[PDB]
Write a structure and sequence with these properties.
The structure is a homotrimer of 390-residue chains. With 390 residues, chain A is α/β, with parallel strands linked by helices. Helices cover 21% and strands 30% of the residues of chain A. In chain A, the strands form four sheets. Chain A has a 17-stranded parallel β-sheet that branches. Chain A has a seven-stranded mixed β-sheet with strand order 5-4-1-6-10-7-11, with helices on both faces. At the A-B interface, helix 7 and strand 27 of A face helix 7, strand 12, strand 25 and strand 27 of B. Chains A, B, C: Its cofactor is Mg(2+).
Chain lengths: 390, 390, 390
């Protein structure tokens, strides 16, 4: 993890206007966590000296969660407010205003809307930045559609000249496919200086953090650009199309990891698995299944098809078919479905059965108890090896 | 829209033998409309002077719908019958036989089996055709598998020489990937003349409309070929594999448009949305959902997973989960599912609840009324704020 | 089919350690058959003189099924045990130990974990091998990720020099994308000789069957390498990611074949169809449907959405919607669903109805009998044209 005293600025003060939502962009969720939660989790895991989230637009709606996140990650996370919305450059300034004017450690700048950014990418960025002893290193990548992204300008020797933002890009610059990831590692002194030379002149009368690269190029300073070949790692979310695209990509990776760890997943494209979910060896997951929240599946289970489980605990060798359930537990070797509905507080004992058109709410159903079909069981406590219906 | 007096021939008189169906090809449906309906809709929206659908094989089965379509589009749509099946050239002839022998406006020829063809493509074709003052302009494109399509023959100066049909293509011509879209814009005089010189000689002893290009090339006439880079726009349906491929592509576009307009769609690949469907801001759609016919969803709803709604009206902030419903309405803030079945004539009031294993037919269920579970409600009128079961 | 006296060795004696399962790799299932069953089926259909499956790791768990398979394919299938696990070369040796020391016919070597290998690929391999009068012909192909595969080494004249296994490959050899399929056709004498010269020296101290190619190259012998452009045909399964990838690919092909034969499949990506399944003309299959085992669907049916049928027989013009069923039959023009559960032994007569939240077990329900909703019917015999509930 991080060298230290590394200080990380997380930039989350812009309007995600293109989301077309009344909920703030970085709060939109993905695989069981908001984009912001994703970022904060990867960052925390490296343990910077400082960690400073910059708020702005809708800050009163986001702050709580940062605090939630701090206590969850057992770490202190500072919040810096952006006075007015004068751009990303200004935004980084507020961020720094959270550090001692004598702070020396390098500074990593990142955004709140790149949910797939992982540890290795961040560790690589630091190591590269230290290796080439750069002033700024900037993570780039190449996309089939650079739309919306800052473009990377390189002379024939691949030396980086600057970054032009989509708004300020010329029709020929727009053709450039190498994009600015928006993940930086700055030497702090270099950084502060470069910020003091920003011009609101062009082209959204804001202070572009991206302008810092040309400035540092200019003033005889060392400027490195590290290209991330796996783009998903560093892609950003601006609209709900991108959100879904990234969701699917991350799901792909979650499922795949479960498969290599011994879980048969019949149709990955339609099996949705949240990041906290655990699944046991030789379990089989059939199509149209979502496993959400803190759902746990033991080994040798059969789950699905068409099963939705949120925060459900499932024992070994259980059968969970066409079941809609949440906040419940299902015992070893138990059989559930098809067409079964588990409401919060259902606890079904080992080898128990809940058959078709059965609904359970707030009930404990003992070991080996069967509820064959067409029956509701609410707020009940049913002993072991009974039968029930209707 | 169209310049006028533009006359459009829609060619729908061939057997879609490769569909392997007893239903006529152009009648097969896609995203809530038949291929023919799709075409007629895009064409109508430009408002040609004349609009002439050519029937032939199975014409008694298709005509009604053209008439349905005419009255639906508030427009007069003529039908021309093909006497015998002597090819596309002949077919265009019958089409013209619906125009005054003194008709002057340009003539656009199109087919009934290119369901994704949109306004811009057609407007571009006319503008190009007028710009270059062509005799014929023909829409082309490039496919990974040109199979079945007419091939575009170009000399080294990209001048178009002719179009060779798949049947008459040589093994080396078959390698050509640029295909004939089958969308033409003809200067009428040029057209009539070129048709009078068609030879049934080769290679299905028919009169190929495609042969017109070589003829006009030949007789010192101006021949343009406009390439449509977005192939889906101009792809044709010959078999059910192609139908499904295009269905999926159009769905992709429908969902995407909803996403950019503010709707969260968790898994686009498994969310099917018909073209007339409306969806409100910040609504969330979970996987395995179809929204069909004239289904309307308000804002801030939660729909799915595994939900199928056809011609259902849903208010704001409603919850519609694992529900199979048609021709019904669901009030603001109402909760439905999981495992709920709505038969035609269900009208559920605002804040009403229909829980698991509940079926409603032809019933009005008042505001705030709950039907918790395992209950059938038929032909009933239930007042406000009641409870029901079983 | 095969020339004869062709003898085929099927190699299934290695640990599929990367499956991370307690079930032997070649036993993992795909589209209604285990990988091994797939291979044996394609091989049998060519009717070699001899057919010899080599077992080893977990052989007591696999043998039964080979015997099951032999009697199923009405053919004698020999099993050869590998004494110790000394590699693929050794493995082929045991295989040969099942043949007469005077056996003359050519020998095809294949593995148990290439479930998509089809007749044409195998027939081509023999014809090529005989044509070029090769000593060994080896099926190759090119993958985007050669990981795990033997690499093909070719000099500038595309002459094949050898095959280097992933373990023994150098970082530059690892870049080679052309892989060894692991499907061989050997002239027997040449083969036996080449095996007697194998060195356990490198790099997993085993006897690599792949080393045979370099040996035969070396000793002035004719060595051919036939490249299979359709990789899926010849891809192998080492982990559950690959299993799912191949499953999906084979499903793609099964569905597509049904589509071209006249079946509308709305969403192929979510329609799963086992290889024995039959479906009738103009039937429509809606999303989230699996058709498993020996399920038969007549013509003009409507199946799905969200329907799972295993070994179910369905008549013409039936409706089967959101139904979970197995080992049952459903009559012509019958209507089933939504939310219907058919347990083994359900036989529903023509024009019968089983509505929502209905479960049937071990029952015969006569012609035109309705069970509207919310009803269980077990072990019953219900006459024609009755009504039932509840």
């Amino acid at each position: 993890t991080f060298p230290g005293d590394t200080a990380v600025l997380v930039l989350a003060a812009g309007p995600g206007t293109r989301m077309r939502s009344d909920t703030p962009k970085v709060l939109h969720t993905l695989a069981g966590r908001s984009m912001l939660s994703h970022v904060l989790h990867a960052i925390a895991k490296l343990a910077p000296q400082r960690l400073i989230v910059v708020l702005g637009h809708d800050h009163q709606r986001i702050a709580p969660l940062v605090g939630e996140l701090a206590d969850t990650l057992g770490r202190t996370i500072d919040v810096a407010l952006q006075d007015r919305p004068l751009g990303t450059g200004h935004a980084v300034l507020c961020g720094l205003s959270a550090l001692p004017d004598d702070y020396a450690g390098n500074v990593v700048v990142t955004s709140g809307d790149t949910p797939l950014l992982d540890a290795d990418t961040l560790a690589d960025l630091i190591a590269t930045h230290r290796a080439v002893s750069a002033a700024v290193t900037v993570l780039t990548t190449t996309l089939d559609d650079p739309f919306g992204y800052g473009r990377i300008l390189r002379t024939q020797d691949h030396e980086v000249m600057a970054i032009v933002e989509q708004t300020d890009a010329t029709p020929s610059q727009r053709e450039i496919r190498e994009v600015n990831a928006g993940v930086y590692a700055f030497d702090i002194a270099a950084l502060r200086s470069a910020l003091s030379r920003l011009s609101s002149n062009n082209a959204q009368q804001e202070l572009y953090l991206t302008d810092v690269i040309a400035i540092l190029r200019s003033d005889g300073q060392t400027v490195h650009a590290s290209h991330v070949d796996d783009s998903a790692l560093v892609a950003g979310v601006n609209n709900r199309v991108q959100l879904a695209e990234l969701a699917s990509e991350l799901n792909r990776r979650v499922v795949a990891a479960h498969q290599l760890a011994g879980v048969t997943v019949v149709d990955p494209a339609t099996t949705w698995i949240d990041v906290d979910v655990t699944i046991g060896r030789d379990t089989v997951i059939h199509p149209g299944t979502q496993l959400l929240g803190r759902t746990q599946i033991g080994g040798r289970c059969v789950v699905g098809p068409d099963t939705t489980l949120t925060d459900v605990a499932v024992g070994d060798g259980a059968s969970v078919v066409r079941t809609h359930g949440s906040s419940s537990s299902i015992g070893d070797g138990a059989a559930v479905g098809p067409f079964t509905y588990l409401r919060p507080g259902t606890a079904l004992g080992a080898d128990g059965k809940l058959g078709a058109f059965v609904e359970v709410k707030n009930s404990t159903i003992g070991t080996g108890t069967k509820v064959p079909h067409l029956t509701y069981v609410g707020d009940a406590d049913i002993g072991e090896y009974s039968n029930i219906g209707a």
